[PDB]
Structures are given as structure tokens and as C-alpha cells.
């Protein structure tokens, strides 16, 4: 009877570590699980992560968009690259953050398979620059110069993009 | 049925080890947990720690200021450079210490992400020098010369700053 287990009860998940295929499978399962108990109860997802890879991040995003309930997101502390692309992929009015939290946007590290798949990596990281552009409200040609550089943005200034829309 | 678990019961937490992201998540959860049982019961937090890092320390402080109950703090033994701050962030009249305990104030070690984020580290460690100045009662220009040097201060002399206000 662990503490995280009790947080799985009443509909919370804690992505806290990192992302790879080992944790991806274990999160996809919990999402599908909690959907089965009730089809309208708001599930949530807390984030505090230092990174993530490309192939697994685009498994949780799809599952998030399929289950009939609606997901909410919060940023506890760090919001590395990629794992924080999930934060901008919840609901249109239920994205939060604490007022000392850092979030950055940057294209992730590593490859797809995790020889080198060139034509496919280059396509995958074009989708990110296009999905992020429909959830914030910006043009595309500005995201293409903020998904190539590195600088942490605070919580009060992240609001002007659209990654977050209410700071508690 | 462990002994710490029984101390989680009747509202105590034991930060005793160190601070990093692994323990941060596990403390934020317990804080949110105990709030759910009762919204007015005084929770406490015992400290005995040799250090801590910057990004995670400013996650517990925010959570501490959000839950409607009020937190109390005690210094068992050592009070490192980052732990100390949490001790000076409880209530205005419920900060204690034992009469052999040492506490020091010093800006922490390491970086933010845990390349190097220069513009952000330098901003974060300005907040510390400003929050500590509203909880003790001193000017700012004295804290800026005590958050740059290293010397342990005893429990009887720490009182004259405001980190502690009643010694048992």
C-alpha cells in the first residue's frame, strides 16, 4: 500500500523521472485503466521531468487524445524539453503551473529507434513545430526559431505564448 | 508497518537525508495528502539535512504556501545551506530549534537543471535574498553579505536575525 498507489486512486499520475519505453508502457496502461472505471471523471497528470525521447513521447500524446475523459496538466518544478510538450497538450483551459516553475521548449535528443533513421527523425520533429502552433495561437515561423535554441522561460512569461493559461 | 509511517500519521514529515528530485516528489505528495484528511490540523516538518539544490527547494516552498493548513518547523541538529531556508518559511510564530543546533545560510551548490543556465541561476538566487528579507525583518543589504560567506551560527544567536523565534 504505497503512497503513489493511493495517488493513482482519485485520478492522478506522477510522471517524475524521465521518459523511455520502460515508463511509457506503464503510463499508457494507467491511462487506459482509469478510463474504464468512469468515462467522464477528470483525470490529471503532474509533470516534473528533466528530458525525454521522441518515439515514446508520441505515444502518450495519442492516447491522451483518444480516451473520452479530459486531461489536466500541472508543472511542478522543471519542465525539460519534450516531456513538457505534453503540458501544452492537455485541455484548452486546464493547464496550470506554480509561480516558480521553469519550462523550456527545444527539440529533443537522441534518435527515433532509440542504422540512423534520417528521413524519419527530420519528419517527426516537424510535427512538433506544427502541433505546438495550434495549441498556443502563434504563427509557425516564430516557433521554428524557438524550437532551435535553448533558454529557460519563467512561469509568468510563459503565459504570453499559450503553454499555460492560469497560474495558481 | 514502519516507524516513519506511523510518524506520517498524526501529521509529521521527516526530511532527514538530502534534497534532490527523487525525495522532492515524495514530500510534495505527503503534503497534499495530509491536507485532504483535515483542512485545519497543524502539520509539522522536522529538518536535519546536510544540503540541497536550488530547483527542488523552490517546489516545497510553493506547496507549503498553498495548502490552507499552517506548517510548523523545527531544527534537529544540522541546518545545511538550503534546508535552513525552508525552516525560515513556516509560520510567523511556530519556528523552533533545540539548544545545541547549528544553522547556516549560504547560497546553494550546483545548477538549475541539475548547457549551464547562467541567466536563470543568477535570477533564482536573487529571490532567496529577497524572500529571506521579509521573514526575518532585516534590510536587504545585510543579507547580501551573509548569503555569500560561510560560518555556522548557533541557536542562541540565530534568534537575533529572525530565523527562529522560540527555543525550547
Amino acid at each position: 500500500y504505497d503512497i503513489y498507489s493511493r495517488l493513482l486512486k482519485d485520478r492522478i499520475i506522477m510522471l517524475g523521472s524521465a521518459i523511455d519505453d520502460n515508463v511509457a508502457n506503464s503510463i499508457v496502461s494507467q491511462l487506459l485503466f482509469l478510463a474504464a472505471e468512469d468515462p467522464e471523471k477528470e483525470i490529471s497528470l503532474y509533470i516534473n521531468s528533466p528530458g525525454g525521447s521522441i518515439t515514446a513521447g508520441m505515444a502518450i500524446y495519442d492516447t491522451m487524445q483518444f480516451i473520452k475523459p479530459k486531461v489536466s496538466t500541472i508543472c511542478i518544478g522543471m519542465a525539460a524539453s519534450m516531456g513538457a510538450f505534453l503540458l501544452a497538450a492537455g485541455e484548452k483551459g486546464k493547464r496550470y503551473a506554480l509561480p516558480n516553475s521553469e519550462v523550456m521548449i527545444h527539440q529533443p535528443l537522441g534518435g527515433a529507434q532509440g542504422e540512423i533513421a534520417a528521413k524519419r527523425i527530420l519528419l517527426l520533429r516537424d510535427k512538433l513545430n506544427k502541433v505546438l502552433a495550434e495549441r498556443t495561437g502563434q504563427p509557425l515561423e516564430v516557433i521554428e526559431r524557438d524550437t532551435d535554441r535553448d533558454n529557460f522561460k519563467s512561469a509568468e512569461e510563459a503565459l504570453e505564448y499559450g503553454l499555460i493559461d492560469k497560474i495558481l | 508497518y514502519d516507524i516513519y509511517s506511523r510518524l506520517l500519521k498524526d501529521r509529521i514529515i521527516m526530511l532527514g537525508s538530502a534534497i534532490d528530485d527523487n525525495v522532492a516528489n515524495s514530500i510534495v505528495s505527503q503534503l497534499l495528502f495530509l491536507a485532504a484528511e483535515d483542512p485545519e490540523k497543524e502539520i509539522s516538518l522536522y529538518i536535519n539535512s546536510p544540503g540541497g539544490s536550488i530547483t527542488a527547494g523552490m517546489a516545497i516552498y510553493d506547496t507549503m504556501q498553498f495548502i490552507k493548513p499552517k506548517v510548523s518547523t523545527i531544527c534537529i541538529g544540522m541546518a545545511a545551506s538550503m534546508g535552513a531556508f525552508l525552516l525560515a518559511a513556516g509560520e510567523k510564530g511556530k519556528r523552533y530549534a533545540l539548544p545545541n543546533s547549528e544553522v547556516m545560510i549560504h547560497q546553494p551548490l550546483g545548477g538549475a537543471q541539475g548547457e549551464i543556465a547562467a541567466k536563470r541561476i543568477l535570477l533564482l538566487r536573487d529571490k532567496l535574498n529577497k524572500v529571506l528579507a521579509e521573514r526575518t525583518g532585516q534590510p536587504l543589504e545585510v543579507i547580501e553579505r551573509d548569503t555569500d560567506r560561510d560560518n555556522f551560527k548557533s541557536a542562541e544567536e540565530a534568534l537575533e536575525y529572525g530565523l527562529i523565534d522560540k527555543i525550547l
Partner: peptide, 6 residues
């Protein structure tokens, strides 16, 4: 973190 997420 309620009121209001939950």
C-alpha cells in the same frame, strides 16, 4: 491542488 485542479 484543489480549489480547482482537482
Amino acid at each position: 491542488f484543489s480549489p480547482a485542479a482537482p
